Amino acid sequence: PDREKALELAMAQIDKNFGKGSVMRLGEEVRQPISVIPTGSISLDVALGIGGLPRGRVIEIYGPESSGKTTVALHAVANAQAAGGIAAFIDAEHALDPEYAKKLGVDTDSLLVSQPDTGEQALEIADMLVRSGALDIIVIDSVAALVPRAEIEGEVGLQARLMSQALRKMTGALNNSGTTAIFINELTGGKALKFYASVRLDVRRIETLKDGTDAVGNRTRVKVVKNKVSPPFKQAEFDILYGQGISREGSLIDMGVEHGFIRKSGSWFTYEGEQLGQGKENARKFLLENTDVANEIEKKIKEKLG
Template sequence: MDQEKGKALEFTTEQIEKKFGKGSIMKYGEGGPSMEIEVIPTGALPLDAALGIGGVPRGRIVEIFGPESSGKTTLALQILAEAQALGGIVAFIDAEHALDPTYAARLGVDIDEVLISQPDTGEQALEICDMLVRSNAIDAIVIDSVAALVPRAEIEGEIGYSSIGMQARLMSQALRKL
């Protein structure tokens, strides 16, 4: 790096630290954040290998996407079982009202220890999720499914009522908050 760029960079980093505090910017090799990512295995070794880190990252939002009956809920339940096997506390927000406890138990989920909610509206589901996240006591939360998170206004509205974009707004707001 030439001397002029070096001075400009030093000045800029000093200004950033003055405004945002020491440690707000630094070179990665000089005590930057650790790249160690805690993971929860999926219970499927080939998938864990394909994900590159050995499972799904802990403390992050992970969306499982696929066609109907492609195994999304099964995978989510396996992740909950793995989190429990590691000693974690898990929650299942059943927006579809379709959780099969017998099937979940066969996948290894200790169903008696799962916090389960069957919310009436999308807002209620996401508020419950937010409260669980903020408790810092939960290791994994599954919302099954995003498609079933129907906004209150859509439920209370008349048939034919235009509710275009309501769910997208609800999800956008919730994801920014979470």
């Protein structure tokens, strides 16, 4: 009754009995099904193992304030739209800035936005919008802001329920609607979202890009703490330039040197015989111009991996 043999027979029993990956091997490189919305971060993408946020799944992006949580979520919308998909933003914070959005790739004009008047109404007009099966991705800003109906008109019935119910019903809908749903949490009802999510992302702001100038934006670190599609606990870091978004080119360098495709002789980045610049900000400014080059590097990492 060989263990390695026994183990597999058993294990496989649980996927059948409970799900795709109710039991994984942190090592497993398993990759199939896919159907993913790129997050716009080559680094975060591999981190998720399937190269993107699984479609038809409930996803939670949490973190503190000024973490870049909405930027990631917005980047998602951008790509989902860029491939002829319809997106819906259920606003309850009223913080959205379409200028930043549009400068990320979002087609704001053709973006469905809604500002519910209550936690219930939010989760209603959101489950309803999902059932139409017309949507690809929908993002709800601030689990927090989804305050119950009472607790609004003075009149207990914590949101815990509001979330649980709305999730119970809505998880199946998009489950077979192929519409991925992003929930943005900020550090209640999250006690359920945690269990309903198939992927939970922890975003924190690590360091700050500077350069003797006012310094633009910061270095973000995302730790995928819950993943039911690939093995969990992987992490990624990427740069968010103030008023510009997630630096693609930058991610290609960090990734490039990491996979040997690029080198750093005296802080002097170079791609196989042809040097790019001294320092990072200079190395990204280079890739920001000539795209074919960068294209190759991207076209080179997308091979070393899925």
